[PDB]
RNA sequence: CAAGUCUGGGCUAAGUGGUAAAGGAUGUGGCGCCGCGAAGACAGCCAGGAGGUUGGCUUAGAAGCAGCCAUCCUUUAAAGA
RNA sequence: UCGAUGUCGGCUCGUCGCAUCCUGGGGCUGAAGAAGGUCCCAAGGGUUGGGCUGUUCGCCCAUUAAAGCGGCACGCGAGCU
């Protein structure tokens, strides 16, 4: 799929999500970005999903960088159960995004296919997104 | 390039930015004065220019300093920047990542490939009457597969650098072909 | 074809939530608990009541029309290829295509006509001849 | 290319053409005859060697045509030059042929007319981008 | 015809708004959108 | 229903106000920085709107207009492989 | 609510919602006509009779313009069974 292949812990707390994104706030690999504005936990299924899209829109071209990866597991109890009796079993796993972050980046394709394809991506997250450019972005130090 | 300054006397931080000055500091290993720059100029240069073209500084005592940016610190939500480290000069050698133009076509653009420009500004040590611009290399000779990298270039008269020599500042990587699928 | 998949997708499936027949209480009355999963490109329906609950019975119910339709299924890739061979398999004495004989020594091919008389010689692997011709005969009447 | 309304332009084979397989049926779809452009035609074919014979037709819709006979195509005229028959399925970098500087203006007396330019150079220059078409090389 | 999503598809598309509701007017009929 | 239909400057035309999301739209109002404006098209209105060349390959057919690849050059006021 | 709120189904009596099964308008259609499909507006009024099973739900027989899906303590036992 698109998990972690190891884990020295099976199931972890939920947590929360106090805005601003810590980091990953410039571009630093291709030239346009895909950057989240509402917080939320992204399923590797939407991972996924929005990368193909991609490559299937403008089919055998540039690279893409996914910066992101779902390395929290998300816990769901079964059916008709009651509360109780231990925490549930794992369903997937899903990447914590917070405003700010950027997910997606791509290079060497024009800047049509480049906007065309990331407003596609953004069609597949549950939040709303901003596509942008690099200029300041350069942190390099 | 040009640009005005003024004197920030140290009061109300993010009450200065919003109405338009923008906060920052001009340090060296001498004195360091804390001022505010509108943002309204300061972004129309700043993205023009970067950190590799010198500023002047027009104080009120009209002093124009050269200088060079350091650090732009973000806001994260919502692009905008917070503050901005000015870095005066003189005639002491210095560094600073100089930009990096790649004129040529990878042989890796033909049958599926992209550069991918990993370090476009290598930082090198150098005084200020010798600040060069687009320091290009040559692309036309990377093969899709092996590619270039390192600090393997020509380096004008005066460029002593300070990478490894090692640190792959660019490669030619393949396409992203639909065939795909899998599970398993 | 090699693969064995049938992921029957619930799309064309038509379930239903009636309620539970036979004892119980006042929740076998008041609860929809018998459900009928119900194939509509086939018209095949199969019914579970065993347990109390309605998603424990309708995946009950779909490991069952998996397995009758795993029999129906590959009934028709059995039914689809004992008419897709062909014909000729009586064994029986006057149903052959070609004859070898080591007495008088000859090979005798009943399609072509062809009369060889190398019989020790074809027990070797010299078909191509007899294959050439026996690719004439046959897609010639078609 | 002349005027419209009932016009068709083909690259006739060489030797014999009569039947359907090339364009035969095309023009008769649009208006034309089967005893017009077949021995009473072949009169140039004979003539210009072989191949392909870029000549074409004119419909009036009573059997008169403007038979303009044309120069091979510059898709085959380079095959000449080279020798590969096809080009390549795909062209761009690497190709089964080779052409030198002056190889293609050994073509240069062949195409002359109607290219645009009297000359050989602002002529030449138009048939290098039919090198980077079909692919043949151009040593240098 | 009537759905959330109203854009232009082909280049003649033209986005009218009548009656308070967006509208959108074009040469071929399958084109036409009523957002509602 | 006791106490200003008070004063000054704005915004909204939906009864929004007086429930709701992803997402759509030349709805309005105010700010931006970029074009390009007597080499006076911003829209209509007159005429043009080309040749190698139908680029190759693939294909019953692929002639700019199924798709894959390359994607230059020439004639002119201009016109794309 | 356990110092009591009778629980399936049928019968009787209905009434309300629309995300409409007919009937009435209408836009597309891969709408020639007729007959279909999908979608929008619109309940005012209709929505049949049997076989089987306690059945609801279903399958089936013969029709019909259609044999709509839901709410009302999966309405209704101080009305019946
Ligand atoms: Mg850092
Ligand atoms: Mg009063
Ligand atoms: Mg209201
Ligand atoms: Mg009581
Ligand atoms: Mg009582
Ligand atoms: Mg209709
Ligand atoms: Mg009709
Ligand atoms: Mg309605
Ligand atoms: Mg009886
Ligand atoms: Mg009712
Ligand atoms: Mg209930
Ligand atoms: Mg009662
Ligand atoms: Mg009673
Ligand atoms: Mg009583
Ligand atoms: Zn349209």
Known sequence: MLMPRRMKYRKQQRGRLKGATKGGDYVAFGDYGLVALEPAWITAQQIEAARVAMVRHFRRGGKIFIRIFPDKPYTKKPLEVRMGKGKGNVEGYVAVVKPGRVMFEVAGVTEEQAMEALRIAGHKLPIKTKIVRRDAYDEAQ | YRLKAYYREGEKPSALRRAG?????????????????????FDKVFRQASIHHVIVLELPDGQSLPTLVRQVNLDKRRRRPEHVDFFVLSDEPVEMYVPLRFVGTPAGVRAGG???????????????????????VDVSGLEIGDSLHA???????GVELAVSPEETIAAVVPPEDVEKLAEE | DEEVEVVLKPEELRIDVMRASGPGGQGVNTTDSAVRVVHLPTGITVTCQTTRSQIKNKELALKILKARLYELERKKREEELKALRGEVRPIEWGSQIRSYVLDKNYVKDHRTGLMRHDPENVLDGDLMDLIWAGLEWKAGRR | ????????KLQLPAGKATPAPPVGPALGQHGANIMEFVKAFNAATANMGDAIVPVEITIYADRSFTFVTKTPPASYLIRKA?????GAHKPGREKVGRITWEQVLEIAKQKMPDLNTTDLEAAARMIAGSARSMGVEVVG | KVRASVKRICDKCKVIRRHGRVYVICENPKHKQRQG
């Open chain 4, 82 to 86: 080279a020798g590969l028959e096809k």
């Open chain 4, 1 to 8: 290319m002349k005027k419209v309304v009932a016009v068709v």
């Open chain 2, 114 to 136: 992209v550069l991918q420009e990993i370090h476009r500004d290598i930082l090198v040590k150098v005084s200020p009457r010798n600040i060069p611009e687009f320091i290009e």
């Open chain 2, 21 to 41: 000055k923008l906060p920052g500091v001009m340090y060296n290993r001498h004195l360091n004065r804390k001022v505010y720059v509108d943002l309204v100029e």
């Open chain 2, 151 to 157: 600090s393997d270039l020509k380096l004008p008269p």
